[PDB]
Structure formats: C-alpha cells, structure tokens
Amino acid sequence: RPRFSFSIAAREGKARTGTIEMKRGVIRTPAFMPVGTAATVKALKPETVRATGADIILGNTYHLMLRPGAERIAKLGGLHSFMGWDRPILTDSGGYQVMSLSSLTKQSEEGVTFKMLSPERSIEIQHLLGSDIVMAFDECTPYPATPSRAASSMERSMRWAKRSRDAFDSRKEQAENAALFGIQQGSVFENLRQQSADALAEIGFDGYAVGGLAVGQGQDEMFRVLDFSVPMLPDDKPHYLMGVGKPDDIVGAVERGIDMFDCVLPTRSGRNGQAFTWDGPINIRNARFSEDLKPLDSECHCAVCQKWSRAYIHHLIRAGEILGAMLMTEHNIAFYQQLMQKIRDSISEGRFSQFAQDFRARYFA
Amino acid sequence: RPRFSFSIAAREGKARTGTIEMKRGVIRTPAFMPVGTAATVKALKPETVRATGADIILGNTYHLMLRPGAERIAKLGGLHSFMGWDRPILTDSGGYQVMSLSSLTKQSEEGVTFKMLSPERSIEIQHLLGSDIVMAFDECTPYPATPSRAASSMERSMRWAKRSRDAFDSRKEQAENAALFGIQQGSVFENLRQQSADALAEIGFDGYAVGGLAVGQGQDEMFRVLDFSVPMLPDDKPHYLMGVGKPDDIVGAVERGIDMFDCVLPTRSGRNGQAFTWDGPINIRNARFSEDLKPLDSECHCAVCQKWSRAYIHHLIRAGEILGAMLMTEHNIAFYQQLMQKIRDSISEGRFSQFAQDFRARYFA
Numbered sequence: 155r156p157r158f159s160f161s162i163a164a165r166e167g168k169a170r171t172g173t174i175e176m177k178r179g180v181i182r183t184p185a186f187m188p189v190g191t192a193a194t195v196k197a198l199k200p201e202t203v204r205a206t207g208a209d210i211i212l213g214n215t216y217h218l219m220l221r222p223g224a225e226r227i228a229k230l231g232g233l234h235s236f237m238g239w240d241r242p243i244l245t246d247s248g249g250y251q252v253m254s255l256s257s258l259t260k261q262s263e264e265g266v267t268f269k270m271l272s273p274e275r276s277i278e279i280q281h282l283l284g285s286d287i288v289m290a291f292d293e294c295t296p297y298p299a300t301p302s303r304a305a306s307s308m309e310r311s312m313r314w315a316k317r318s319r320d321a322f323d324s325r326k327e328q329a330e331n332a333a334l335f336g337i338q339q340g341s342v343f344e345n346l347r348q349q350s351a352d353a354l355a356e357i358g359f360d361g362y363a364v365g366g367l368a369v370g371q372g373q374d375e376m377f378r379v380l381d382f383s384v385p386m387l388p389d390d391k392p393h394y395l396m397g398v399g400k401p402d403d404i405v406g407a408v409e410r411g412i413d414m415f416d417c418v419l420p421t422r423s424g425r426n427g428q429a430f431t432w433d434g435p436i437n438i439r440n441a442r443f444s445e446d447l448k449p450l451d452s453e454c455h456c457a458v459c460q461k462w463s464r465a466y467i468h469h470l471i472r473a474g475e476i477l478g479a480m481l482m483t484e485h486n487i488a489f490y491q492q493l494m495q496k497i498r499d500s501i502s503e504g505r506f507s508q509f510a511q512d513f514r515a516r517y518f519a
Numbered sequence: 520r521p522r523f524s525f526s527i528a529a530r531e532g533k534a535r536t537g538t539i540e541m542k543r544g545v546i547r548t549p550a551f552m553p554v555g556t557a558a559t560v561k562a563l564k565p566e567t568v569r570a571t572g573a574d575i576i577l578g579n580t581y582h583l584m585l586r587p588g589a590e591r592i593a594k595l596g597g598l599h600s601f602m603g604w605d606r607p608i609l610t611d612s613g614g615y616q617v618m619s620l621s622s623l624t625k626q627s628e629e630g631v632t633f634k635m636l637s638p639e640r641s642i643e644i645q646h647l648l649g650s651d652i653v654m655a656f657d658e659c660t661p662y663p664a665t666p667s668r669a670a671s672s673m674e675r676s677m678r679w680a681k682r683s684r685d686a687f688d689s690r691k692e693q694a695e696n697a698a699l700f701g702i703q704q705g706s707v708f709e710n711l712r713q714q715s716a717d718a719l720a721e722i723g724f725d726g727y728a729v730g731g732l733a734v735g736q737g738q739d740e741m742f743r744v745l746d747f748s749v750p751m752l753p754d755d756k757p758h759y760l761m762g763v764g765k766p767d768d769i770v771g772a773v774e775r776g777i778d779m780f781d782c783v784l785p786t787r788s789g790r791n792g793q794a795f796t797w798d799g800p801i802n803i804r805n806a807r808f809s810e811d812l813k814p815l816d817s818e819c820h821c822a823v824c825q826k827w828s829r830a831y832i833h834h835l836i837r838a839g840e841i842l843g844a845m846l847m848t849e850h851n852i853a854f855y856q857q858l859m860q861k862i863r864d865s866i867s868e869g870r871f872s873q874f875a876q877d878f879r880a881r882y883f884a
C-alpha cells in the first residue's frame with residue numbers, strides 16, 4: 155500500500171463513496187471513527203472494535219501526552235503496539251482538550267501553555283505516538299464568535315497550519331509514512347470559511363477537516379455552514395467533519411460532501427444508557443424495558459443483539475455493572491458502522507437520497 | 520447426561536480428580552467457580568468466562584432476589600437464558616449476604632427477615648432462577664464463636680438442611696433436573712463438625728460443602744479444620760469449600776480432599792489491580808510496571824498475556840479505564856483455571872504432592 159491514496163468510486167449529488175489506502179490498511183468512506191481516549195476505545199477490546207466494522211480509530215493526544223506520555227509510548231513501541239490496534243489511527247492535535255480540560259491556560263502566537271503545546275510539539279507528539287493521520291494544530295473558535303474574533307482565530311490557525319505542514323515535512327519517517335490533514339476554521343461566516351479553505355489549499359494537505367462546527371451549533375446551522383463550506387475544499391481529497399455526530403447529523407453531512415466522522419456519542423452515551431436504533435434512540439434504563447426480551451434493535455447484526463435482551467442490559471446498566479457498559483458500547487459502535495455501510499452501499503447504488511429520506515422518516519417517527 | 524453423577528478417576532493421598540456430569544454439562548474436578556454477582560461475572564462476557572476454561576459459575580442469589588427479582592428472571596426464561604451462560608450454575612442460598620449486606624435483620628427458627636428468606640423460600644428462589652446446583656439454606660456462624668453458639672447455629676442449620684431437602688424434593692422439576700448440596704457447620708470444633716457431617720449424611724445430599732471457613736480464619740487454622748472435617752463427609756460425593764480462596768489455599772485444600780471452590784478474589788482483586796502469577800501476586804499499579812513490556816505472567820496461556828503488556832494494563836488501571844478491569848479479570852480467572860488444570864493433571868499422573876511443593880516454593884519465593 156501507498157502512504158496515502160484517496161479514490162472516489164461513486165457519487166450522488168455532493169455525496170461520495172470510496173477508499174483511503176494507507177500503509178496500515180484501507181479505510182472505507184464515508185467513515186466513522188470510534189474515539190479512543192487514553193489509548194482505549196472505552197469498554198472495548200480492539201478486536202471488538204474491528205468486529206463492528208471500524209477501519210480506523212481516533213486517538214485523543216491530550217490525555218496521552220499527560221499519561222502515559224508520548225515519549226513513553228514511543229519507547230514502548232508506539233500507540234498501535236501499546237493498545238493492540240494495528241490498523242490506521244487518526245490523532246487529534248490536542249488543542250481542543252488543552253483548552254477545555256486544562257488549567258491556567260496561556261495562549262500566544264507560539265502555542266498554548268497549560269497545567270507548551272505548539273504546532274511543532276503537537277506534530278512531534280503525533281509522531282511519537284505513531285499516528286497514521288496527523289492533524290494540524292489549530293485554535294477551535296468558540297460558538298458564537300464575533301466576526302472579528304473568528305477572523306483573528308482563523309488567521310492564527312492558518313499560520314499554525316503552515317507551521318504544522320513544515321514540522322511534518324521536516325521529519326522524514328513521518329512524511330513518508332503518515333498523512334497530514336488541515337483544518338478549516340472561520341466559525342459560521344462564509345467569507346472566513348473561504349479564506350480558510352484557500353489558505354489550506356495553497357499549503358496543501360492530504361485531507362481537509364471542517365473544524366469548529368461541534369461546539370454548540372444546532373443542526374440547522376451546522377448544515378447551513380456545510381452547504382457553503384464543503385464545496386470550498388479540494389474535491390479530490392477527503393473531507394473530515396470533526397466531532398459530529400448523531401446518526402441524523404451524519405446522514406445530512408454526507409449529503410453535503412463529508413467523508414469522515416468522529417464523535418464520542420456512541421461510546422459515552424452507551425455507558426449512560428442510551429442505545430441507537432433505526433427507530434431512534436432509546437434509554438435502556440427506562441422501566442418499560444425491564445421485561446422486554448427483544449434485542450436493543452430489531453435488525454442490528456451485532457453480537458449483542460444476537461445474544462442478549464433489552465431486559466438484561468436494562469438490569470446491568472441500572473446495577474452499574476461493567477458488562478452493561480461493554481454491551482451498550484459494542485452495540486452502539488456496531489450501529490454506527492452499519493449506518494456507514496448503508497450509506498456507502500446506497501451511494502454506490504445511486505439511491506442515497508432515497509435512503510436518507512427513508513432513514514429520517516423512521517428514525518424520527 | 521444424567522441429572523447428577525460424580526465419578527472419581529484418580530486419587531493421590533486425600534486428593535481426587537474426576538467429573539460431575541449434569542444435564543447442562545460436565546464439570547472437571549477439582550473445580551474453580553467464577554462468581555457471578557447480579558447475573559454477571561464482573562467485566563466478562565460469558566463466552567470469555569468459558570474461554571478461560573470454567574465449566575460452572577456461581578450465581579449469588581441475594582442480589583438477584585432483590586434485583587431483578589427471582590420471579591422476574593423466571594418469567595424472562597431463567598438465569599441461564601437471561602445472562603447467556605448455558606452450562607451449570609451453582610446458586611448460593613442467599614443467607615450469608617442477607618446477614619452481611621442487609622439492614623435490620625431479624626433471625627428466627629422460621630428464617631431471616633431483612634431490609635422473609637426461609638429455607639423453603641431460598642430453595643424456591645434457586646428454582647425460579649433455574650439453578651443446576653442448589654445450596655441448602657443455613658446459618659454461617661461468625662468466627663470466632665464460642666462452642667455453645669457454634670453448636671446452636673449448627674443445630675439450626677441441620678434443621679434447615681432437612682427443610683431444604685424436603686422443599687427441593689417436593690418440586691418435581693427441581694428434583695429431577697437439579698442437584699442439592701448440604702453444608703457442614705460447627706465452626707472450628709471437631710465434635711460439632713462431626714455431628715454436622717452425620718446429620719447431613721443421614722438426610723442425604725448430592726454433595727457436601729464445608730461451610731464457615733472463609734470468615735476470618737487464617738490459613739493454618741482453616742487447614743487444621745479441614746484435616747479432620749473433610750474425612751467426615753461421604754467419600755463418594757463432591758466436597759465444596761465455600762469462599763476459598765487464594766491460589767495457595769486452593770492447593771492445600773485439594774491436598775485435604777476438596778473438589779470444588781468459589782471466591783471473589785480473582786474478579787474483585789483484578790479490578791483493584793492485583794494480578795496472579797506463578798511467582799506470586801503483583802500489584803500492577805506499582806510504578807515498576809510503567810514500562811514493563813512483559814505479559815502479566817510469563818507462562819500464562821490467556822488471551823490477555825498473548826496480546827497486552829504490563830505497561831498497558833498499568834496505564835489502564837491507573838486511568839480508571841474499563842478495559843483495565845476487563846483484562847485484569849480475564850487474566851486472573853484464566854490463571855485460576857490453569858491452576859485447576861495443573862492440579863487435575865498432576866493428580867491424574869500421581870505427582871500432585873510434588874506439584875504442590877513446587878508451586879509453593881515458587882509462588883512464595
């Protein structure tokens with residue numbers, strides 16, 4: 155396999171389906187990436203993550219650079235070996251979590267200090283972890299933002315995008331074996347989104363993320379911004395919507411040209427008792443499930459739905475049992491993978507628009 | 520398969536090895552039963568429990584009769600179906616936990632009331648769960664106890680043993696498909712242990728537990744009581760030491776004629792960071808493991824030791840990650856199953872005494 159090759163096999167409107175080939179494996183697009191926080195997809199063995207159909211996972215960097223530490227993981231052979239996932243890993247840059255989880259932060263043009271993460275140090279950390287897809291280090295503008303502050307943040311992010319590009323390219327093994335994605339910023343403003351896309355395309359990246367749209371915008375607003383923002387990006391490279399989302403967010407984003415997704419909702423809300431079904435989410439703790447012998451979802455192909463009832467998982471979650479977290483999480487990630495497969499197949503068959511409408515009518519009934 | 524058939528294939532001193540055939544499967548003896556609390560072996564799928572080599576699990580009754588409730592589990596098809604374990608289940612009687620975890624208990628000759636569990640109700644609950652091995656409901660004398668109080672409690676337990684026997688036999692489906700074990704009491708007193716054995720043998724049971732020896736006695740004292748107590752029991756039936764124990768407790772108990780064991784140590788202390796190894800237990804949270812790439816145990820055949828390092832599991836446990844609990848637990852139950860297999864094979868080969876000595880010298884080095 156090549157270091158990086160994105161191929162589009164079929165299209166329908168703005169939607170695409172295809173593949174990203176990388177040294178550690180092939181990624182089917184549109185793709186959902188389960189999130190690995192602290193070198194684990196919570197409550198799942200990596201073999202279970204793969205069994206659900208995931209081709210790639212996201213590793214948060216922030217926690218890892220704090221524990222066990224990046225240099226430590228490098229000494230131990232890298233994140234793939236450490237956690238036992240041998241397929242591609244996309245690593246976030248650490249910037250968002252450094253802002254939201256850290257103390258006494260101090261921002262500057264050089265980077266952020268917290269209780270010094272700069273673009274160079276972020277790219278270095280991603281290297282030490284052995285990331286396959288490295289994200290440029292940026293500033294994730296809050297929502298709402300005034301146009302002046304949005305512009306300022308976006309401009310800084312574009313300077314840091316060039317810094318990230320140069321840092322990555324100056325490390326031979328990283329440039330030869332990994333890929334680098336740039337992140338579009340600009341809040342909800344079309345002119346800033348365009349400036350950002352133009353800056354990123356002049357630098358050149360292997361893929362383009364749409365940053366800053368999962369920090370409080372409602373779906374209508376997010377979709378409106380995607381309508382004008384995704385077409386600004388190079389057509390022939392993957393389009394990654396960071397931090398999105400609910401099943402219906404994903405369908406609509408693919409309708410608007412997105413190829414890749416990550417979010418904590420299937421894992422986090424699985425542990426809290428929310429199960430995704432084709433008829434919408436259910437909260438398994440509700441008393442109406444205490445004697446329900448049906449599987450979480452009536453059509454789901456996952457191992458959990460093959461073997462255990464709603465009633466049993468209801469009991470586990472109410473009891474605080476680890477196995478409850480395990481089963482809810484497996485099911486929910488499997489549901490997300492089955493959604494992505496249905497999306498891929500319907501685009502390939504020229505019937506995605508009909509799928510999206512059918513999906514919506516039943517998911518919201 | 521028969522409802523119940525215990526066959527002894529080989530002997531060495533007081534040690535035996537053989538099989539218990541039951542309708543839902545064969546149990547290799549000496550046997551270790553992982554403990555299922557609230558219809559789950561904590562942090563493990565039942566297929567994982569079986570993969571480690573377990574032939575039978577213990578289900579605590581106390582929690583289950585409280586949630587989800589026994590009648591509820593019966594309506595849902597029974598505990599095997601509910602939790603997805605299709606092999607034998609031994610259920611405790613609920614009596615111990617009713618005393619240690621309940622509030623305002625009120626004991627009487629009829630049974631115990633708490634915030635009415637009687638022998639009849641206990642046997643009924645075990646039926647509703649669909650237990651394969653039902654335990655007689657008894658009183659688990661505290662340690663220490665004066666001889667007068669030990670005698671009183673043992674005498675009550677023997678009356679309740681007869682009540683349990685009659686309750687079990689009066690339910691055709693239970694008498695035809697399950698087995699019933701009686702529990703020897705008497706604290707640490709030889710004359711009471713003898714009286715108890717005699718009472719139980721006159722009633723007649725399918726197997727005989729040694730009760731009341733895991734409630735604060737040290738190993739030397741426990742072994743001393745086993746020395747005289749196990750020979751009092753019928754030779755041709757299984758001997759079950761309740762609530763024991765550490766690897767070395769198990770080896771010595773088998774040397775004294777015990778066939779079956781349960782305890783929470785591998786599951787509970789796995790979640791707390793203790794891993795069993797042939798060189799003794801280790802506490803994986805210790806800093807000395809932070810960069811140790813070896814498996815938990817150098818010879819262990821388990822999936823965890825095949826794939827993950829000490830360093831990774833160290834990280835998981837310190838981070839509070841569910842996967843840490845999962846891997847520690849799988850390993851520890853696998854270690855216990857491998858110990859039982861080594862014990863079975865060495866008795867069968869006439870070299871168990873040598874195994875026990877070799878085990879001790881290395882486990883305690």
Ligand SMILES: [Zn+2]
Pocket residue numbers: 450451454455456457458459460485486488489
């Ligand atoms: Zn499912």
Ligand SMILES: [Zn+2]
Pocket residue numbers: 815816819820821822823824825850851853854
């Ligand atoms: Zn192991």
